[PDB]
């Protein structure tokens, strides 16, 4: 499963947000590894929008237009147990709940991060 609970990350416009998603695999989890990150924007009604994906040993991005080029996995070895990603140059539009799904049949886990972006620094 994923090593961290549902959390809230508060950043400032322009900064970069690090969305942690580390996981441990069980001996039973013998199926192929899939890592999907979805987002439910606060500004609109869309829910569970695909942001980035790791399937069949390949990375697939370019799903959520407004987030183009600003999302990348942080680790250079996902299989090792780290699905974390970075959202660079945060904008107020990036506010919403980001979800990390890590699957290895029969294994499945997910984590929800509520990202908040503030015009200028301070959560004081």
């Amino acid at each position: 499963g994923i090593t961290t609970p549902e959390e809230m990350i508060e950043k400032a416009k322009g900064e970069t947000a690090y969305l942690p998603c580390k996981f441990t695999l069980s001996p039973e989890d013998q199926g192929p590894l899939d890592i999907e990150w979805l987002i439910s924007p606060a500004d609109n009604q869309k829910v569970d929008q695909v942001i980035i994906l790791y399937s069949g040993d390949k990375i697939y991005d370019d799903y959520y237009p407004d987030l183009k080029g600003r999302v990348h996995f942080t680790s250079n070895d996902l299989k090792s147990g780290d699905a974390s990603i970075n959202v660079t140059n945060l904008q107020l539009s990036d506010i919403g709940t980001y979800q990390c799904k890590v699957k290895k049949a029969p294994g499945v886990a997910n984590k929800k991060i509520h990202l908040v972006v503030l015009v200028k620094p301070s959560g004081a």
Binding site: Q30, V50, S55, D62, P106
Partner: protein
């Protein structure tokens, strides 16, 4: 048993698992449960990338096929929609069991009832009216063809959502659609 032998699904919340027009551009959620000689099925399809997010003006139909071998085991190659790494098999929790399906013919459409060369026959079809987006102002039809895109000793399920012609700049998305068929075994 850790898994349920009466259910074959893609898991309730699959990741993009089809490359219909372009790589991993769609999510196909499919669940099949065997109730004696009848399979109760619920299918749902939604575009997540490319033209499937913006139905092209000329598009009138969007469809997918699932082709199985003589043991009822899915074949992950054209024209099967689900990609090779996609989850498909017995249900185990919110995921899929890694066991191989050994009772596959219990989920396959009966070939006596739906002969391989009979896909054009009304009987090899279950057609219903439904709605794009689930929006009752956007009616569409769903046709499920049994064993029409077969092999020999093989089986198949085809899903065609038609009447899309007059729906533009809308992502392609269906409601959970029900269907059923007589089983081979």
């Amino acid at each position: 048993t850790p898994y349920d032998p009466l259910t074959l699904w893609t898991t309730p919340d699959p990741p993009p698992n089809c490359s219909l027009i372009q790589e991993l551009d769609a999510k196909l959620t499919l669940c099949l449960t065997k109730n004696g000689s009848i399979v109760n099925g619920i299918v749902s399809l939604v575009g997540v990338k490319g033209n499937l997010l913006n139905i092209q003006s000329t598009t009138t139909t969007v469809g997918v096929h699932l082709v199985f071998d003589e043991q009822g085991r899915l074949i992950t190659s054209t024209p099967t929609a689900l990609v090779p790494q996609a989850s498909w098999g017995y249900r185990q929790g919110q995921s899929v069991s890694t066991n191989t399906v050994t009772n596959g013919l219990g989920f396959m459409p009966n070939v006596s009832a739906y002969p391989r060369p009979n896909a054009s026959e009304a009987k090899s079809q279950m057609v219903s009216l439904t709605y794009l987006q689930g929006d009752t102002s956007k009616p569409i039809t769903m046709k499920v063809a049994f064993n029409g895109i077969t092999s020999l000793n093989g089986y198949s399920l085809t899903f065609m959502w038609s009447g899309l012609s007059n729906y533009i700049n809308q992502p392609f998305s269906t409601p959970s659609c029900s269907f059923s068929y007589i089983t081979q075994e």
